[PDB]
Design a protein around this nucleic acid. Sequence first.
RNA 1: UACAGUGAAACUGCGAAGGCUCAUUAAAUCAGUUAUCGUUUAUUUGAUAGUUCCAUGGUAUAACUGUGGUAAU
Lengths: 46, 112, 805, 134
Amino acid sequence: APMSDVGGVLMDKDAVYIDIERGEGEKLMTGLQSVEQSIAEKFDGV
Amino acid sequence: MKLNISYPVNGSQKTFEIDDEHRIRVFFDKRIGQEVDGEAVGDEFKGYVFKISGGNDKQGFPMKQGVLLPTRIKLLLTRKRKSVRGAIVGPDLAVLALVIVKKGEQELEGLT
Amino acid sequence: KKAIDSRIPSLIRNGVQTKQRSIFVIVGDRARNQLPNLHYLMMSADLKMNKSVLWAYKKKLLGFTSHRKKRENKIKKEIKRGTREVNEMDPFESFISNQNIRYVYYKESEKILGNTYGMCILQDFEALTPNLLARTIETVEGGGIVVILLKSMSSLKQLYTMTMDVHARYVVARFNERFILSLGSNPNCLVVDDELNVLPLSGAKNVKPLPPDELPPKQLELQELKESDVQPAGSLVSLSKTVNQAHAILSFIDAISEKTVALTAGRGRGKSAALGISIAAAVSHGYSNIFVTSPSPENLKTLFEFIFKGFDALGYQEHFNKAIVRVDIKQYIVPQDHQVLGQAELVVIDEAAAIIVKNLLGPYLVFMASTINGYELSLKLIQQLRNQQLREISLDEPIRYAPGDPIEKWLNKLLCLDVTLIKNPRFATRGTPHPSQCNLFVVNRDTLFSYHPVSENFLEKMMALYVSSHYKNSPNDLQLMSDAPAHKLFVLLPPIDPKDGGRIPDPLCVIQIALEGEISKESVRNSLSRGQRAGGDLIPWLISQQFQDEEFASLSGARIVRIATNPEYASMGYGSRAIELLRDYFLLLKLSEQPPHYLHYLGVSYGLTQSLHKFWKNNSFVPVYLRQTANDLTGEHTCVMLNVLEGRESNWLVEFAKDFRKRFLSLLSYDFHKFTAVQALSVIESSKKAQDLSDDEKHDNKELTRTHLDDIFSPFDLKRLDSYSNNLLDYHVIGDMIPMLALLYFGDKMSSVQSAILLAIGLQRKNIDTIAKELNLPSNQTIAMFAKIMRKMSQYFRQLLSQSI
Amino acid sequence: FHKFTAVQALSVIESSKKAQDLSDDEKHDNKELTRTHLDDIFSPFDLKRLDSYSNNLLDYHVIGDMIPMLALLYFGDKMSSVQSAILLAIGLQRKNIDTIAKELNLPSNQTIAMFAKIMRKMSQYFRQLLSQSI
RNA sequence: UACAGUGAAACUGCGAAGGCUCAUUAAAUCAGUUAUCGUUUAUUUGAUAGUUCCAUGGUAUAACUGUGGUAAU
């Protein structure tokens, strides 16, 4: 069944609509997601 | 293989996932009730003697004490036809079940 | 209901469009209900896909049971209880009840090496071995996802080492952190929360590629041009892959179809279907070939070639381990062993698998032969091929399950299967003085596995150096040497003062099979309920019954590898060996001078290897004692394995002399039963045992010559009469097959014998006959050398008679 | 190995004919070594005695103790009882063909291995009796 | 402060203690009736037990704990 949610996963035009270390997951999902763009090389001048 | 070793008078027991089959090769064709030495099986359990009691192989089948034939056989127990592994321990076990009765030279921290 | 993210479905969409795999790394506690969502998105983007899913694990399942009858009766009594409605199921139960899953153990992951899966779910993180990862992702198909479920502890370790370089407190392993840093490098991986949030800490941004394989239509055009005979039916059956693979298969067909003796050794990767093209050309051989064929892979290892040969037969015209008997509806082909079919080489067609160069040169001698060399030594094989067969050796390394993926790049990286065999040193003329200098460096394996591009470059050079032309080790040895606690390395690369960089002339690997340190590691590993990591200490203390080697530490050579360019590379390897003996006698950066000026307390130092000629030469340059052996010929190369060690400690005199003496006693008695290889290096190893007794013992481990009573007890007076008869007459077996064993034992135990008498004693210690060993090794004048050896026998007759009476 | 492809049952027949000829002429005036302890310690070393007794009274490898699998069978032949099954196994070892070669010929691998373990255990008891009696 | 009310799993006492389809057996099926000192009979019911020389009898095993094997009852 497309156009509807087999499971909970409804299919829009492009979007995906789903319905469903505590502090670690909290920080990583809230603020610390895109923080490691400039944390990769860490002064490694090859 | 795995060794489930039990000390009786304190009432304790622990298992080891033991790799390197050449130490376990001492146990081949040594049936239930036969006593073993710590030398060929370890350097960290020397002075350790065990009385085996069979053990479940792969597919979880037991070893009923005192018959023959380290393969699987079909017999009658409580009077229906059921498959067991034999008496003698063979090359394809999961666990051997051991009882330690004499302590040796390297102390244990989970059993003792 | 909530919209998730613009990056995680777009990665799947462009992956199934451009045919590249992707990596989902799910973290959290309720981490089982989220994988069918990813499965439905993967199917909805591309219905035209493989359907099966792998759920490999190490010990146990998540909360489910992999038994539909078990979860059916469990949920049946849940309905009988009445806390759950009758028509109800959650999407993870829908996943395991509806889809087709193969649940394999991590320990038995080898049972799925050839078939294809549309998904791979690596369950546990803490034992992720690179042989298993390289087996899985090479079979996951091009529009595929691989999913990895993490821990609370492993999520903490990722949050720790995702700042710059940090590590966790309380064996330690760094291959998991190298894998996490590899997926930080790859943009084809993304870490996803239980609530389908995305961690952009590895592969942050990804777009939707534009709405849409020119080579695949070219493969169709190649199939059509071959189509419009039985060769066309076979070619249209065969070309299920890249056009280069189709070219190799059709060229092999046209090479062994009309011709009858070429020898072509095509080299393919783990992709590209070497065995597929071979099995599809087998039907072309069976039609336009002889009625007899010769297969030379290992036993019960060519089921894929049997499947492809059966598919070729079905496509054209048809109808103590396995059932490998051949079939016929109209000819015979059977999977032979090592070269025992040298008499049955009346077959015209022969083909072999990858690599023994001598055993591949032996059986493939008088018929039209091919070979399939896999990547997963081939340079030396092709050099011995060119120095000897209208060589149409051609096979391709185009990718068969994909076009090529960044996840395939991460597979090559985290499996360390990339190599570049350029020298890239300062100079060879500046490296010969580096071998004269012998200034070595320690490994510092924690910082070596801490992957920077400089560290990855050094690890790449050392890894290709160590895996180059070895004894065919594997990713299990890679993960071991990456995370073994009782292990280190040594490399004396550059002596010159150029800029940032270097080389590696020869790497070595030591394994501290100790007493104090191994006792500590054994008491620690018993708490972890596992552990067996002492080979050289355990083999000699049981074989030769060594209380001394039990009470001392030990160092076993895990491996040693240099270049194969010239003898100067092995000269630099010997210099690094002498430098290691000098080092044992005499965050952080990924090299050391302090640990190159520090050492441990080890009781002996040496290595075990197969009883090879060049390894025996290295053992002689080593000259460390070649102790007691094991006669077991390993089924790969037929070689017996022995351990040569030196006692580098305070008082190893008694231990070294006693083990060398018992080995010298045992080698003469074992030199007939299962050790009769070649006289030269075996007698040279006997002289090595004698020089080991000379170096380690002075006057304690010394037996005297056999007495008058001992010489009268071993032979008789009839032996003296028959000895005089062989002296003054002929020397047949009527008087020299009674006393030959006593003569050989006394000759190699107790005043001097020359080269010809020593070769005769080598034949008599191998218990061989007359014109075999003498006219095989020296290969001239069998009767003249036999009469001179009989003159030596008359000398031994006078020797024993004048010694006794 | 002067022949190396002669038969084991033919070897038992040859040992039987030699034994009948050596036992019944009138009476054998040529005695063997009835437990000479210094001769036993001279032929086999004390390492050989400890190694054979260790592989008997414990589990070691037959391939790890086969250095005493050559002269001891000849000692049981010439100079204890071994019926013509264990005698044929010892005769195959004296022809230096493998225990696997005689075992997949006659009975079975673990069969001939446990029979040779019985023969070596009796030989270990014999050498134990000699080394304890002197 | 040796047992204490609800109380998820076991044994026990009892329960399910009487129902579909196919080929066509003529006082042999079936019924009434005599007997069973020729005999089995739980249950109901009525009666009906006399041999002791120089302060209460031993362990084996559940449940219970603990270590494990198996895709799995």
